[PDB]
């Protein structure tokens, strides 16, 4: 047969614009395709995108940034008024630290 | 409104972390102790574990044996 | 591995032939009856690891 | 062969295995091995042809030599201590003889050459029986005498088994030989952890038995003994090839499938002792078994091979005999990992 | 290496000793039991698929039997596993109690007294 | 056997290079003898003289690989005055690999053998230093 | 007429039901970690005259 | 030179070559019981000498 | 966090119980709803993580990755349904099932509290990807690609498992909280060096590290579009997440150990950027660009500074989005002309103007135009490296040049010039493709509007 087997010829690609000039490229069924477009656009842009950005933008301050700022202002005010240094090189009180007896 | 509707206070997460940490630390200490106990029991054989069978003494026949010296 | 059916049912399928000091016919003793009898009584119930020492 | 005779022979094989498994006397264990071999020989020759005869002859020669070495080990042990109970094996020479004889019985390397030949020479049912049921008795004896084992010898044989299983299975187009080499590698895995924990050995044996049963039952369902024969199955039963691919994935050891559970646990156990290098080498070697499982999956499920015309007629008929335990075996061989802690019930 | 086979007082083929009756049984809503039922359902679905039947609708009695059998086996499997772990913990604690020399509770030191080397990241 | 291994290991690293080379040669030779025995068993040589030739070839090569490895490793260790250093074993392994490549008359074999044998010998020295166990005794 | 509509669109409740079940299971999981409720040094507090727990 | 040749030559191609060669070595047996029963004898002697004599 | 895990397991039977012509709609809608639900994980604390239970926890490092995964699922659903039109219903449901299983595994991976559960899930992610590549790929090399994708991973990850169990025998726990609180220094010994290598090389091969990257061009070129999207967007970030987690136990051995990986990463970013300049295949160029960016992330994790960690997080998120967009862009042209040669189809700006606008935005974001989060992460990493050693500004600087070149090169080859005369089947762009591009690109700029949400826990 000069051939190796029986095979179907390679089919040509179908153009969705041939049967539906306004096709949206979702499905060959016009109604199913239109509703696929509608649900994608509504739940992607209208629901998740805008409402999610609004929700994230107004997320309450659990990172405690304003609290840290107010605490810093209080500490700075007290230390400046009392004449103490603004920050100490030791974050732990040396009275609670027991260094080794001998260094020699 | 978001914090009131969707989220709880910080004390809940704080104390839940306390409980989780306590449980996990106890599990870690128990694992280390179990490994040590297994090592000791297998080395000595004086515990309930790693007991290998020996001959039952109930199989011995304590009767005269046709000769005085067994 | 070892399913102790004999011990569970109290059957004694083959334990009668395991040791030399176990009820021979006509009470015929083994050549080393006393030594085996002593070793078995020493090692009984304390486990193989402790028995080996 | 008469169905009554075949049933009697299968029951005799099983009874020999249980006699090995319930005995406390070395003579009774040897007798169980003898009876098992005697009843097993005709099962290999159920469908008569020269290849089956050659396979049965090779199996008989190997098992007879192994049984004679087993008897010699028992006699030497009796000589150095008048003990018949299966116990800590008071003599080291007798223990070496026992280890070598049981390795020959199990098909552990380097006493492995007979397994692919025997598996290839017999039918799929006899191969199923040989590769699943015939492992229980020697492994049970090995579990019983584990305390007196020489770790060097069995660890050498286990590593050799894994290496040889992977390398030999890499070269096979016959499905039965692929199964035999996989069996050799899994035997190595089960024997590697024996001196450290027998519960892991039992768990690995159970998972391997489930996977092998599912694989062999799927190979019986679609009458394929070669790669090219199995490449036609998608045109007749695609669900069978899909389940085959997932089963091969599980046997390869990939998470989250059940085949990952034994190796994982074994590795963990070997790190509870020091033993760091051996598990690493064992996993790196098991990658070879994974490779040829993947090649089989490529040939049968993930691609579509050309078919024949007469296959059309096969579309019009159905499978008459249906294996009842196939779905449960597939499910157990794939979706069982989340139930891993249940292994505590084994000890 | 066998850890628990030679443990004194062990009945050969019991699978559930009387002592295990002293432990709380697993709840019928245990997620492990639910997973076992899921395994039974999967087995039923695969059974339908292999025999070329409607997978979801073919045999409701067969699928029910599959799920019930898996749950029934899983309940006792979980009971035995819990019993084994309880036994392990009991033996461990008893051995620790009876060998104080091997498990000494040494002095606890505060972090203000222990010198830890500092390795800067730079 | 372990007698040869103990004979090799008893001598300190950078001392008595001739004795260490002799022990390594023995270890290499023994390995060659086993390999040739298995090779003859599984692949018959069709003639007794051909089998003798194959045995001699394998045994000589193994002995040569071991001799050069031991000599080079000991010489490097004593020259650098740095025992307990895996680099000496790396040089010994690569020298053995180049010896194998010359024996088989192949550049790729020589390069691969140098790299792999050097890495393996360095790993063996590391395991000796740190106490890594290939066959760990059961402890738990 | 709603029989066909239901038999076609009954698969649209699986995900919301799963979400609600997940919330319930998360609450049940939270119920099992109350060993330090109103006991930490940082948040230890005397209870209000009416309330029973500081958080559920 | 690097990506298509040498990085390929060292890691994956060397591994494939070695595994294929070892597979050919391991699985090329004529199926004669004489040869590998001789191998069994050699193995038994080696195991009796190396492992059994060192206890 | 079962409130996100359970809805995906419910996505499974919904897909398998759907009508033959409604699978895509249901899957897309409910995936988008799940993404909206998962958006709540961004409310993180400043001191510790959100510890949901004994099994799952959410950190500031994992929440953006979870959001990225849940957002990517609908995009892959939209991209896949074009080339699977002629496929039977059962195989379409199987493809959707594979995608759902992959998303479930990734979600459970990014929140596991224990390292061994993380390992199990991070390895379970292999099976659906391999099945997708080797079954729904187009050409014959896909099979080979699958093998390269598999063993390259496993050879790296099998040692890690060993190390993991070893650690649990020494410290008694693999819980990340207990591991962090009870951390101890690593000594300088051969055993510790090999423990370091075992803990690190799996994640290195996942990134992938230069020299260990040969699997990636094959896997990303031979895979279908959804496979490429998930491979480039999320699966590469598993290595970075795992490395950032595991580095807490490797100090101070890390300073000595990192050197070879740092030099490999820098010279390899240079080499891969150079490779992108001479590439006849459009997908291979994007793959090698991914390799370059991941090399930058490797350097960032390895130098181990807070700024470097923030840069790594930002760059990982940005690269995921950008690479997914670029792969979709290339797939549009491939579906039009059924070829991957870059010079086959030219002058596409004349025929497809809005598609050319999408190409321009994607290429602009690839080269890290400010103030995009790509540039934020890149600049933070560069500053950290400069603090590490002032000479690094050379190599990084060279990268910043070469990258731009090839990026614009790609654009200039595809969109500008004159159209090929004999190609007469360039249909107008569909609404689906434009929507896919827009849903890729808008979150990037929205994230730029608020950058602290993707800067990680060190913020
Ligand atoms: C982790 C979280 C939890 C997840 C757990 C893991 C996954 C789930 C469990 C797995 C087992 C479940 C299903 C097993 C049976 C499947 C067999 C089958 O063929 O299915 C076809 C069957 C359709 O057949 P049909 O309806 O008779 O008519 C079509 C013809 O049969 C037409 O059929 P055909 O034969 O002519 O078509 C041929 C086709 C047929 O070939 C197949 O269908 C392949 C099926 C193989 C099953 C998997 C193997 C064993 C399980 C291992 C799973 C591994 C998971 C781990 C991750 C690794 C991934 C592999 O073969 C091919 O085309 C070759 C394509 C090559 C692709 C290779 C990929 C295959 C592996 C994919 C496995 C993914 C997991 C299973 C997903 C479910 C699949 C249905 O599917 C179903 O309808 C059943 C599936 C859904 C049932 C459950 C839904 C319950 C009711 C809904 C309500 C939910 C209740 C919620 C509770 C609260 C109340 C509100
Ligand atoms: C408690 C457990 C312990 C139990 C174990 C202990 C047992 C001890 C009791 C033994 C009592 C003996 C009773 C008789 C036994 C049965 C013998 C028999 O039936 O022969 C059948 C067998 C087949 O008969 P056939 O088929 O009718 O005729 C075939 C033609 O003969 C030939 O046909 P072809 O020309 O076509 O083939 C070419 C030719 C090719 O012949 C050859 O290639 C052999 C040339 C090897 C050169 C020798 C090495 C020289 C340097 C090494 C020195 C080592 C120490 C010094 C250190 C280094 C020094 C610088 O033959 C072969 O290929 C056959 C290979 C067989 C060679 C010997 C097998 C022993 C193991 C393999 C060793 C391989 C040598 C490597 C070196 C290993 C260490 C020595 O006959 C033979 O193979 C030859 C006769 C051998 C019998 C005498 C030796 C018996 C060995 C017993 C154990 C020792
Ligand atoms: C992650 C990023 C990327 C990384 C990965 C990628 C990059 C790395 C991997 C790529 C390169 C690795 C390949 C290694 C060599 C492969 C050999 C091979 O393919 O064999 C099969 C292949 C098949 O051959 P065949 O079938 O067996 O026989 C037919 C022959 O083709 C017929 O042959 P023929 O008649 O034409 O002539 C052959 C003959 C003569 O060949 C010729 O005809 C022409 C002359 C060529 C030889 C050049 C030597 C003199 C010039 C070298 C100057 C110094 C080196 C540069 C450093 C400068 C320092 C500032 O060669 C010889 O006789 C061999 C004598 C040995 C001399 C060369 C060995 C030197 C080793 C280097 C030591 C470096 C130490 C560390 C340095 C630290 C400081 C940086 O063999 C060859 O054809 C090639 C022969 C020459 C190979 C040796 C050249 C050495 C290459 C450098 C080695 C360093 C890399 C490994 C380092 C780690 C090792 C522990
Ligand atoms: C700075 C201006 C401020 C304006 C305030 C309001 C801006 C709202 C913009 C909304 C987002 C832009 C749209 C992006 C998607 C493309 C939409 C589309 O398909 O257009 C077709 C649509 C319909 O036309 P058509 O007839 O179909 O034409 C289609 C043909 O293909 C013909 O197409 P074509 O040739 O017209 O191509 C579109 C066009 C434009 O399309 C694009 O390229 C959009 C992407 C821009 C570059 C993206 C890479 C860089 C990433 C930066 C990230 C910034 C994020 C900021 C927050 C944004 C949140 C969304 O291409 C270009 O003209 C080249 C753009 C070069 C941009 C260089 C900007 C560098 C940074 C600028 C400073 C930003 C920070 C300011 C504060 C600094 C400190 C004081 O045309 C338009 O709607 C106009 C395009 C928008 C141009 C605005 C460019 C500046 C705004 C940047 C983003 C928004 C920032 C808002 C804050 C102020 C900054
Ligand atoms: C087509 C033609 C286009 C041209 C015409 C366009 C017309 C104009 C439209 C463009 C708008 C210009 C933008 C200018 C900035 C205004 C908005 C800004 O002010 O809001 C920011 C807020 O923006 C948001 O925070 C960022 C959006 C969140 C992004 C999340 C993406 C949504 C999820 C989707 C999936 C994501 C996948 C990726 C995973 C990481 C401010 O942040 P913040 O300083 O705080 O606010 C302080 C006060 N608060 C805190 C009380 C609220
Ligand atoms: C891949 C899945 C593997 C599953 C394997 C098959 C599952 C179904 C088989 C059903 C088992 C029937 C046993 C129940 C009848 C009672 C018999 C009972 O008395 O046996 C006792 C013991 O009970 C059994 O051993 C328990 C079997 C339970 C097997 C399941 C464990 C699998 C590991 C986790 C995988 C997930 C399981 C999922 C289940 C569907 C005897 O104890 P003992 O005589 O002193 O031990 C002998 C061995 N020793 C001495 C060496 C220790
Ligand atoms: C000590 C033992 C170490 C064990 C190492 C395990 C290696 C794991 C991979 C094994 C691959 C083996 C492939 C092989 O040998 O076959 C050669 C094979 C022949 O093709 P076949 O499919 O067999 O035949 C079809 C046409 N007749 O050649 C190929 O083309 C192979 C192509 C795919 C293989 C790609 C593997 C990529 C893996 C790279 C990293 C792996 C390194 C492993 C060790 C890591 C270092 C510790
Ligand atoms: C596609 C590429 C992927 C391949 C990369 C794979 C290589 C990974 C690196 C090697 C990992 C091996 C280590 C395994 C886990 C070690 C855990 C550990 O800490 O064990 C050490 C021991 O460390 C070891 O035993 C490791 C020895 C190495 C054996 C296996 C060698 C594998 C190859 C080594 C060279 C490869 C180098 C990296 C790969 C380079 C890229 C090709 C401590 O044990 P102890 O005995 O108790 O010591 C204290 C008391 N004495």
Name the residue facing G11 among I1, I9, I26 (closest C-beta): I26
Strand partners, D25: D85
* Among chain B residues, CA nearest to G55: B12
CA dihedral A43, A45, A51, A53 (to 10 degrees): 140
Pairwise CA distance, residues F61 & F103, whole Å: 7
- For ligand 1, say whether the CB of I17 is within 6 Å of any of its atoms: yes
Distances (CA, A) of D107 to D12, D23, D130, D155, D157: 22, 23, 11, 15, 10
Contacts of E78 (CB under 8 A, 6+ apart): D342, E26, E30, E32, E33
Contacts of B2 in chain A (CB under 8 A): 55, 58-60
How far away is chain I from the Cα of E56, in angstroms, using its nearest Cα?
10
CA angle A71, A75, A78 (to 5 degrees): 140
CA dihedral G25, G31, G33, G34 (to 10 degrees): 170
Pairwise CA distance, residues D135 & D129, whole Å: 10
How far away is chain I from the Cα of E46, in angstroms, using its nearest Cα?
15
The DSSP 8-state label assigned to residue A4 in this structure reads S
How far away is chain H from the Cα of I269, in angstroms, using its nearest Cα?
13
**E36 lies in some domain:** yes
Distance H14 CA to ligand 7 centre (A): 9
**Residue contact D272–B55, C-beta within 8 A:** no
**Residue contact F132–I189, C-beta within 8 A:** no
Pairwise CA distance, residues H36 & F38, whole Å: 9
Distance I356 CA to ligand 5 centre (A): 25
Q: Which helix (H) or strand (E) holds E39?
A: helix E31-50
**E111 lies in some domain:** no
Contacts of D289 in chain H (CB under 8 A): none
How many CA atoms does the CB half-sphere of D170 hold within 13 Å? 25
Q: In Å, what resolution does this model reach?
A: 2.7
**Residue contact E12–C3, C-beta within 8 A:** yes
CA dihedral F36, F39, F40, F44 (to 10 degrees): -150
Pairwise CA distance, residues F86 & F83, whole Å: 9
Distances (CA, A) of G49 to B9, G52, G54: 20, 9, 12
Name the residue facing I432 among A25, A49, A55 (closest C-beta): A25
How far away is chain F from the Cα of B31, in angstroms, using its nearest Cα?
13
Neighbours of B70 (CB within 10 A): 16
Distance F40 CA to ligand 2 centre (A): 9
**E117 lies in some domain:** no
Pairwise CA distance, residues D236 & D227, whole Å: 15
Ligand nearest to the CA of I63: 5
* Positive or negative: CA dihedral I143, I148, I149, I155: positive
Name the residue facing H35 among F2, F42, F112 (closest C-beta): F42
Beta pairing class for I57-58 and I50-51: antiparallel
Helices and strands, counts by H and E, chain B:
2, 0
How far away is chain B from the Cα of C7, in angstroms, using its nearest Cα?
11
* Among chain B residues, CA nearest to A58: B2
Residue whose CA lies nearest to ligand 2 atom number 4: H45
List subunits contacting chain G, requiring 3 or more Cβ pairs under 8 Å: B, I
- For ligand 1, say whether the CB of E39 is within 6 Å of any of its atoms: no
Which of D136, D125, D115 minimizes the C-alpha distance to D180? Answer: D115
- For ligand 6, say whether the CB of D207 is within 6 Å of any of its atoms: yes
Pairwise CA distance, residues D255 & D262, whole Å: 11
Pairwise CA distance, residues H42 & I264, whole Å: 49
CA angle I161, I167, I172 (to 5 degrees): 125
Structural domain for G6, as ranges: 1-56
Ligand nearest to the CA of I375: 4
* Among chain G residues, CA nearest to B17: G33
- Check: CB of residue D56 under 8 Å from CB of residue C37: no
**Residue contact F134–D195, C-beta within 8 A:** no
Residue whose CA lies nearest to ligand 8 atom number 24: I191
- For ligand 1, say whether the CB of I14 is within 6 Å of any of its atoms: no
Q: Which helix (H) or strand (E) holds C7?
A: helix C5-9
Name the residue facing E50 among D199, D326, D339 (closest C-beta): D326
Q: Domain total for chain G? A: 1
* Among chain A residues, CA nearest to B3: A60
**Residue contact G40–B8, C-beta within 8 A:** no
Name the burial class of residue D320, with classes exposed (0-12), middle (13-18) and buried (19+) by CB atoms within 10 angstroms of its CB: exposed
Name the residue facing D322 among E51, E85, E88 (closest C-beta): E51
- Portion 110-139 of F in contact with H at CB < 8 A: 112
**Residue contact A97–E112, C-beta within 8 A:** yes
Helix, strand, coil shares of chain A as percentages rounded to 5?
Answer: 50, 0, 50
Name the residue facing H12 among I214, I271, I275 (closest C-beta): I214
- Check: CB of residue I170 under 8 Å from CB of residue I250: no
**Residue contact I214–H2, C-beta within 8 A:** no
- DSSP structure string for I72-141: HHHHHHHHHTTTTTTS-HHHHHHHHHHHHHHHHHHHHHTTBSBHHHHHHHHHHTHHHHHHHHHHH-SSTT
SS (H, E, C) chain D: CCHHHHHHHHHHHHHHHHHHHHCCEHHHHHHHHHHHHHHHHHHHCCCCCHHHHHHHHHHHHHHHHHHHHHHHHHHHHHHHCCCCECCCCCCHHHHHHHHHHHHHHHCCCCCCCHHHHHHHHCCHHHHHHHHHHHHHHHHHHHHHCHHHCCHHHHHHHHHHHHHHHHHHHCCCCEHHHHHHHHHHHHHHHHHHCCCCCHHHHHHHHHHHHHHHHHHHHHHHHCCCCEHHHHCCHHHCCHHHHHHHHHHHHHHHCCCCCCCHHHHHHHHHHHHHCCCCHHHHHHHHHHHHHHHHHHHHHHHHHHCCCCCCCCHHHHCCCCCCCCCCCHHHHHHHHHCCHHHHHHHHHHC
How far away is chain D from the Cα of H3, in angstroms, using its nearest Cα?
24
Distances (CA, A) of D272 to D196, D259, I198, I411: 9, 21, 18, 57
The DSSP 8-state label assigned to residue E19 in this structure reads G
Distance D90 CA to ligand 1 centre (A): 56
Structural domain for E55, as ranges: 1-99
- Portion 120-149 of I in contact with H at CB < 8 A: 148
How many CA atoms does the CB half-sphere of I141 hold within 13 Å? 11
Pairwise CA distance, residues F137 & D151, whole Å: 7
Distances (CA, A) of D269 to B35, I119, I167, I340: 11, 18, 13, 50
The rounded Cα D154 to chain-centroid distance in angstroms is: 17
Q: CB contact, 8 Å: B60 with chain D?
A: no
- Portion 77-106 of E in contact with D at CB < 8 A: 77-78, 80-81, 84-85, 88
Distance I432 CA to ligand 3 centre (A): 56
Which of I198, I410, I449, I426 minimizes the C-alpha distance to I325? Answer: I410
Q: Which helix (H) or strand (E) holds I287?
A: helix I282-303
CA angle I260, I266, I272 (to 5 degrees): 120
The DSSP 8-state label assigned to residue I428 in this structure reads P
Q: Domain total for chain E? A: 1
Collapse the DSSP code of B51 into the 3-class scheme (helix H, G, I; strand E, B; otherwise coil) and give the result.
coil
**E43 lies in some domain:** yes
Contacts of E3 in chain B (CB under 8 A): 38, 49-50
Ligand nearest to the CA of E51: 1
Contacts of A26 (CB under 8 A, 6+ apart): A32, A33, A34, A36, A37, A40, I24, I81, I430, I431, I432
């Amino acid at each position: 047969p000069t051939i190796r087997l029986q095979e179907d010829p390679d089919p040509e690609d179908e153009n969705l614009y041939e049967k539906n000039p306004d096709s949206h490229g979702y499905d060959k069924d016009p109604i199913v395709d239109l509703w696929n477009m509608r649900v994608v656009f509504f739940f992607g842009f209208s629901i998740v995108l805008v409402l999610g950005s609004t929700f994230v933008a107004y997320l309450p301050d659990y990172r405690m940034q304003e609290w840290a700022r107010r605490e810093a202002e209080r500490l700075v005010k007290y230390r400046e008024a009392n004449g103490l240094p603004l920050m100490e090189s030791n974050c732990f009180d040396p009275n609670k630290i027991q260094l080794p007896e001998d260094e020699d | 409104w978001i914090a009131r509707t969707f989220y709880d206070g910080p004390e809940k997460n704080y104390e839940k972390t306390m409980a989780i940490l306590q449980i996990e630390a106890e599990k870690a200490e128990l694992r280390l102790k179990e490994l040590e106990v297994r090592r000791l029991m297998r080395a000595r054989g004086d515990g309930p574990w790693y007991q290998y069978p020996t001959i039952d003494k109930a199989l011995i026949d304590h009767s005269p044996k046709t000769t005085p010296d067994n | 591995p070892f399913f102790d059916v004999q011990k569970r049912l109290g059957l004694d399928l083959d334990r009668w032939m395991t040791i030399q000091s176990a009820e021979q016919p006509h009470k015929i003793p083994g050549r080393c009856h006393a030594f085996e009898k002593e070793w078995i009584e020493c090692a009984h119930g304390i486990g193989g690891i402790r028995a080996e020492k | 062969m008469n169905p009554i005779i075949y049933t009697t022979l299968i029951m005799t094989v099983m009874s020999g295995t249980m006699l090995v498994m319930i005995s406390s006397h070395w003579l009774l264990i040897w007798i169980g091995f003898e009876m098992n071999l005697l009843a097993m020989i005709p099962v290999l020759m159920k469908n008569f042809n020269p290849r089956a005869t050659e396979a049965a002859t090779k199996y008989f020669l190997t098992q007879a030599t192994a049984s004679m070495m087993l008897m010699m080990a028992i006699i030497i042990n009796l000589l150095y201590s008048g003990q018949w109970t299966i116990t800590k094996m008071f003599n080291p020479v007798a223990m070496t003889m026992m280890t070598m004889a049981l390795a020959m019985k199990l098909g552990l390397s380097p006493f492995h050459f007979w397994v692919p030949e025997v598996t290839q020479g017999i039918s799929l049912q006899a191969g199923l029986l040989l590769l699943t049921w015939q492992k229980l008795a020697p492994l049970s004896v090995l579990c019983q005498i584990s305390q007196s084992i020489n770790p060097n010898l069995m660890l050498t044989m286990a590593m050799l088994s894994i290496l040889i299983g992977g390398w030999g299975g890499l070269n096979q187009t016959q499905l039965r030989k692929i199964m035999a080499y996989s069996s050799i590698a899994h035997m190595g895995w089960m024997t590697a952890v024996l001196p450290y924990n027998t519960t892991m050995t039992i768990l690995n044996l159970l998972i391997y038995i489930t996977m092998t049963l599912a694989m062999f039952m799927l190979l019986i369902h679609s009458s394929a003994t070669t790669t090219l024969s199995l490449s036609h199955t998608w045109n007749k039963m695609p669900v069978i090839t899909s389940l085959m691919m997932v089963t091969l994935l599980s046997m390869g050891g990939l998470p989250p499938l059940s085949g990952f559970m034994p190796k994982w646990m074994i590795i963990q156990e070997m790190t509870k002792n020091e033993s760091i290098i051996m598990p690493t080498l064992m996993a790196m070697t098991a990658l070879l078994n994974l490779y040829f499982y993947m090649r089989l999956a490529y040939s049968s499920s993930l691609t579509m091979f050309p078919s024949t015309n007469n296959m059309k007629m096969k579309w019009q008929f159905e499978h008459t005999k249906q294996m009842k335990l196939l779905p449960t075996m597939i499910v157990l061989s794939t979706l069982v990992l989340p139930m891993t802690p249940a292994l505590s019930s084994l000890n | 290496m066998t850890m628990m086979s030679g443990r004194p007082g062990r009945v050969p083929l019991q699978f559930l000793p009387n002592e295990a009756r002293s432990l709380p049984p697993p709840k019928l809503t245990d997620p492990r039991l639910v997973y076992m039922g899921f395994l039974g359902y999967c087995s039923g679905l695969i059974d339908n698929a292999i025999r070329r039947r409607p997978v979801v609708s073919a045999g409701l009695h067969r699928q029910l039997l599959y799920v019930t059998s898996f749950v029934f086996f899983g309940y006792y499997l979980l009971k035995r596993q819990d019993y084994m772990y309880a036994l392990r913990d009991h033996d461990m604690f008893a051995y620790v109690k009876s060998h104080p020399e091997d498990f000494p509770e040494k002095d606890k030191k505060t972090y203000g007294e222990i010198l830890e080397e500092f390795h800067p990241v730079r | 056997a372990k007698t040869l291994l103990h004979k090799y290991s008893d001598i300190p690293e950078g001392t008595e290079c001739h004795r260490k080379a002799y022990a390594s040669t023995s270890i290499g030779g023994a390995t060659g003898l086993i390999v040739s025995a298995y090779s003859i068993a599984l692949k018959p040589p069709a003639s007794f003289l051909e089998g003798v030739a194959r045995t001699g070839r394998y045994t000589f090569t193994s002995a040569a690989i071991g001799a050069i490895f031991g000599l080079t490793s000991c010489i490097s260790a004593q020259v650098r005055e740095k025992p307990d250093d895996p680099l000496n074993y790396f040089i010994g392994g690569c020298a053995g690999g180049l010896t194998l490549g010359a024996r088989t008359r192949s550049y790729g074999i020589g390069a691969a053998a140098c790299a792999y044998m050097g890495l393996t010998a360095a790993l063996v020295k590391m395991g000796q230093l740190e106490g890594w166990q290939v066959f760990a005794e059961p402890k738990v | 007429n709603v029989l066909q509509i239901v038999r076609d669109h009954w698969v649209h409740i699986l995900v919301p039901v799963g979400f609600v079940f997940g919330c319930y299971l998360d609450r049940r999981s939270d119920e099992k970690l109350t060993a330090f409720r109103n006991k930490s040094l940082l948040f230890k507090r005397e209870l209000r005259p009416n309330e029973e727990v500081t958080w559920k | 030179l690097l990506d298509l040749i040498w990085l390929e030559t060292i890691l994956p191609k060397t591994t494939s070559f070695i595994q294929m060669k070892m597979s050919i070595m391991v699985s090329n047996q004529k199926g004669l019981i004489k040869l590998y029963f001789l191998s069994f004898l050699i193995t038994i002697m080696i195991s009796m000498t190396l492992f059994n004599y060192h206890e | 966090m079962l409130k996100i895990i359970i809805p995906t397991t419910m996505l499974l039977p919904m897909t398998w119980m759907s009508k033959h012509n409604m699978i895509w709609i249901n899957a897309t809608v409910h995936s988008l709803l799940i993404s909206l639900i998962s958006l709540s994980l961004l409310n993180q604390l400043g001191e510790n993580s959100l510890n949901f239970s004994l099994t799952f926890f959410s950190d500031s490092l994992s929440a953006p990755l979870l959001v990225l995964t849940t957002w990517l699922l609908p995009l892959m659903l939209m991209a896949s349904q074009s080339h699977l039109s002629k496929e039977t219903t059962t195989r379409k449901k199987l493809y959707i099932t594979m995608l759902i299983l992959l998303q479930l595994f990734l979600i459970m991976t990014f929140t596991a509290t224990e390292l061994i559960l993380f390992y199990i899930l991070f390895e379970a992610t292999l099976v659906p990807t391999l099945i997708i590549i080797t079954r729904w790929g187009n050409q014959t090399e896909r099979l080979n690609a699958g093998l390269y994708f598999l063993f390259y991973t496993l050879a790296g990850s099998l040692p890690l498992l060993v190390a993991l169990v070893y650690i649990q025998n020494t410290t008694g726990s693999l819980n990340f909280l207990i591991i962090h609180y009870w951390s101890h220094p690593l000594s300088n010994s051969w055993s510790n060096i090999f423990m370091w290598l075992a803990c690190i090389m799996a994640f290195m091969v996942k990134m992938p590290l230069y020299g260990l990257h040969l699997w990636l061009p094959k896997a990303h070129v031979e895979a279908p579009i959804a496979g490429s999207m998930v491979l480039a967007a999320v699966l590469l970030k598993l290595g970075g997440y795992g490395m950032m987690r595991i580095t807490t136990i490797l100090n101070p051995l890390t300073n000595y150990m990192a050197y070879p990986f740092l030099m490999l990463s820098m010279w390899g970013m240079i080499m891969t950027s150079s490779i992108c300049l001479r590439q006849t295949d459009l997908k291979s160029l994007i793959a090698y660009s991914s390799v370059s960016h991941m090399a930058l992330v490797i350097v960032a994790i390895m130098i181990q500074t807070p700024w470097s960690f923030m840069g790594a997080t930002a760059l990982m998120i940005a690269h995921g989005l950008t690479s997914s967009m670029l792969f979709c862009l290339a797939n549009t042209n491939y579906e039009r002309v059924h070829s991957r040669t870059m010079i086959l189809a030219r002058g596409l700006q004349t025929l497809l103007p809005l598609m050319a606008t999408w190409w321009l935005v994607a290429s602009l974001t690839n080269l890290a135009l400010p103030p995009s989060i790509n540039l934020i992460g890149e600049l933070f990493i560069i500053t950290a490296s400069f603090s590490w050693s002032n000479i690094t500004i050379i190599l990084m600087g060279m990268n910043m040049m070469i990258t731009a070149l090839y990026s614009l090169y790609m654009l200039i080859t595809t969109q500008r010039g004159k159209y090929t005369h004999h190609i007469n089947n360039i249909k107008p762009s569909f609404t689906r493709e434009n929507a896919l591009m827009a849903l890729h690109i808008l979150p990037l700029l929205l994230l730029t509007l608020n950058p602290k949400m993707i800067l990680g826990p060190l913020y």
